[PDB]
C-alpha cells in the first residue's frame, strides 16, 4: 500500500477572503480618529 | 533539427541528410514523424538517386510511428532494402504484417480467383516464398504445411508433403486437418483431390484411403476403376476388404451407380 | 512470457524505477533515456498494459529535467490512457501534462487534469508532492483569476 | 588547416560572389576545431543573412546556430555575438505572430531575463507591453535599441500594431475629430491620412468619423434554441430510461 | 521463424477471451436472479 | 521553479482593476482611472481601456473629446439563456454518477 512519492522532495467560523483583505489599523483609530481630527 | 538541411539543392547534401535521418531515427521518431511529407516527395522523384533508401527510411519511420499498412507499402516499394529477414525485430513485425496482408489478399479472391482479381504484388509473394523456404530448411514441416493449407495455395503445401517426415504420417495429418478443421466444401474437394493424387502415387496402393477420398467427394467411376484394378492385381483379399469397407460407409445411390460402372 | 514477464512485469517496472533513481542520484540520464525508449518500443507490441505507463512517466520526468519540447512525444502516444493504472501513474501523468500545458500558453485545459492529479493522490502521508502540485494549481488559477 | 575562409572574413560581402564560398564551406564541413570554425562560419552567415532578407536561409542559419550553441560538451563557453543572434531570432518569431514557441524558447534561458543581457530585456519588455493595450512605449522604444539595427522586424511590428489600432478604433466610437486620428496614429500630416482612410473606408468628412453597431442578432429569437434544446431533452430522456 | 509469428498471434486472442469471460458471468448472474 | 510562469501576470491585475472600476462606477474621468491604477501615464490609460473593451471585458464607451467613460448598464440575467446551460452541466454530471 501507498507509494510515499519519494522522488519529489467550523474550525474557523466561515472561510471567506474578505476577512483577510483588511490592511488598515482598526476603524476606531486609523479611520475615525484619523479623519475625525479636525482637518475640516 | 538537421532535416532543414534537406532544403538545399545539392544531391550530396540530400544523401547526407538521408544518412543522418537513418542514423538518428531510433531516438527522435516522434519529432520526425510529422515531417514525412518532404521525405515522401524526395523519394517520389524517379530521377533522384537513392530513392530506395529514402523509401526505406520512410517505411522505418512509419513502422516506428505505429502504422502497419503505410510502413508495409513503403517497405514493399523499397524492394531490396528489406533483404534481411532474421535479425531485426522491426523486420519481424514487417514480415508478420506482410504475411497477414498476403493472406487477406488471397482470401479476398479465394471465392473466385478468375473473377477479375486484382494483381497481387510479386514482391509479397517472393517474401512469403523466402520465409517458407527458410522454415522448410529448419525442418519445420508441420508449421509450413499448416500455413500453406490456410494460405489458399496448393503448390507450397504439395512441395512440403515430401520431406523428412514419413509420407503416411504426413498424409494422415493432412487428411485429419482437412476432414476436421476445414469448413468450405469447394476447397475441401480440391484438397481431397490433391491428397488422392499422392495416395495413388504411394509405393503401396492403399484402397483403404481411396475409399475415404471417394466418399468425401462422390466419384463412383473412380472407385469402380480402383476396385477393378485391385481385382486385376490377383489380390482377392484386398478387393474383398475394400468392397466390405466401402459398402458399410456409402449411400444406396453410390452403390447403385458403382454396380453399373463395375458389372457393365 | 510462458512465465517470464507475466510474474515479473511489476518486478521489471520496479527495477526500471530503481535504476532511474540511482541514475538521477549519481549518474546521467541520457543513456537511461535511450534504454527506456528501447524497452518501451520493445513493449507496446506484445501487450499494452502495466508496462506502457511507468516507462512513459520515467521518460517524461527525464525530459522534464531538461528543457526539451516534452510535448511531441506525449501527443502521439495512444497508451497515455492505459485505463489500468491502479491510481498510481495517473497522478504523475496528469501532473506532467498539466505542467506542460501551463508552460505551453494554455490554461483552460490543464485545470481539470491537475485537479484530477491532486484528487488522485494518496490520502495519507504523501507530504512532498501535494506541495508543488497545489502551489502550481493556485499559481495557474491566479493566471485564470 | 583546410580553412579556405581567411580571405574575405573581415571584409564585407555585400551580396557579392560569396554564395559559392558558403557552399564550399558547407562541402568542406562534410578534434573540435573543425566544429568551432564551422560554428563561427554559421554564425557569420546568420548575421549576414539579415541584411539580405532571406527567410529560409535565415531560418536554417538560426537553427544551425541554436544547435551549435545548445551543446553541453566541453566547448567554448560563450561568444560575443550569441546573445545578439538569440535576440534576433526572438524578434523574428515574434514578428510572425507566433507566441507558443515564443514562450517555449524563453525557458531555455535559466535566469538571464532580468539579471543581465539587456539584449533579452528589451524583447521581453516589448512583449510585456504588447500583450496589453499599452502602445506608446512600443513606438518610444522602437527609436531606442542598444543591441543593433533590428530594423528588419520593428517595421513589421509597427505595421501590425498600426493595423490593429485602426481595427480597435472602429469599435465603441460614434464621433471623433480628424486630427485625433493623426495624433493617435503616428503619421502626422503626410497626406497618408486620406489614403489610409481609403484603406479603412470610414464614412463622413467634416472633420469627423462615424461607426454603427447592431449586436441584436443573438437576442429576440427563440427559434434557434427550439431544436438544440429539444435534442438536449431527448438526450436526458434517453439516458434516463435505458437499462444498463 | 514462423513460431514467433504464431505466438504473437496467439497471445492477443488469449487476452481477449480472458477479458470477455467476466461479462459472461455478470450477465448469467442477473438472468438467474 | 515557477518564476517563468509568474512574471506574465500583471495583465490580469490590470484586467481585474478595470473590471472592478467598471462595476463600481458608471461615468468616470480617465485621469481618475490612471490615478487609481497608477499607470504613471494618462495617455496609456485610453489605450488600455480600449483594448479591454475590444475583447469583451467591459461594455463601456469613452468620449475622446470629453474624456469621461460612460458605462453601459444592462441587467436582467434571469431572462438570459445562460442559467439553462449552468444547470444542464450539473444535471448531466448527476446523471452520469
Coordinates of C-alpha atoms in Angstrom, one line a residue, chain D residues 103 107 114 128-129 131-137 167-169 171-173 176 184 225 228-229 232 236 239-240, chain F residues 3-4 8 10-11 14 41 43-44 46-48 50-51 53-54 60-62 64 81 84-85 88 91-92 95:
Chain D
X103 CA 7.3 31.3 -24.8
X107 CA 12.6 28.9 -20.7
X114 CA 16.2 40.2 -15.7
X128 CA 5.0 42.6 -22.0
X129 CA 4.0 46.0 -23.3
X131 CA 0.3 41.8 -24.5
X132 CA -1.9 44.5 -23.0
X133 CA -3.1 47.7 -24.7
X134 CA 0.0 49.9 -23.8
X135 CA 1.2 51.0 -27.2
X136 CA 3.1 54.3 -26.7
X137 CA 6.1 52.5 -25.0
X167 CA -9.2 47.9 -36.1
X168 CA -9.8 48.8 -32.4
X169 CA -10.8 52.4 -33.0
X171 CA -15.4 49.9 -32.2
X172 CA -17.0 51.8 -29.4
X173 CA -16.9 55.2 -31.1
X176 CA -14.0 61.6 -33.3
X184 CA -3.2 58.6 -32.2
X225 CA -32.8 27.1 -29.2
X228 CA -30.9 22.1 -29.7
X229 CA -32.9 22.2 -26.5
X232 CA -30.9 18.0 -25.1
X236 CA -31.9 13.4 -20.9
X239 CA -30.0 8.3 -20.8
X240 CA -32.7 8.3 -18.0
Chain F
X3 CA 9.5 32.4 -12.0
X4 CA 8.9 32.0 -15.7
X8 CA 3.3 37.1 -17.1
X10 CA 0.4 41.9 -14.4
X11 CA -2.1 41.9 -17.3
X14 CA -4.9 45.4 -14.9
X41 CA 0.8 58.0 -17.7
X43 CA -2.1 58.6 -22.4
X44 CA -1.8 54.8 -22.0
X46 CA -7.2 55.3 -23.0
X47 CA -5.3 52.6 -24.9
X48 CA -5.7 50.1 -22.0
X50 CA -9.9 50.4 -25.5
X51 CA -8.0 47.1 -25.5
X53 CA -13.4 46.9 -24.4
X54 CA -12.4 45.2 -27.7
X60 CA -18.4 50.8 -21.7
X61 CA -17.6 53.5 -24.2
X62 CA -15.3 56.5 -23.9
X64 CA -12.2 61.3 -26.6
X81 CA -30.5 31.7 -21.6
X84 CA -30.2 26.8 -18.5
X85 CA -26.6 25.8 -19.5
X88 CA -27.5 21.4 -17.9
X91 CA -27.7 17.7 -14.5
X92 CA -25.6 15.7 -16.9
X95 CA -27.0 11.6 -14.4

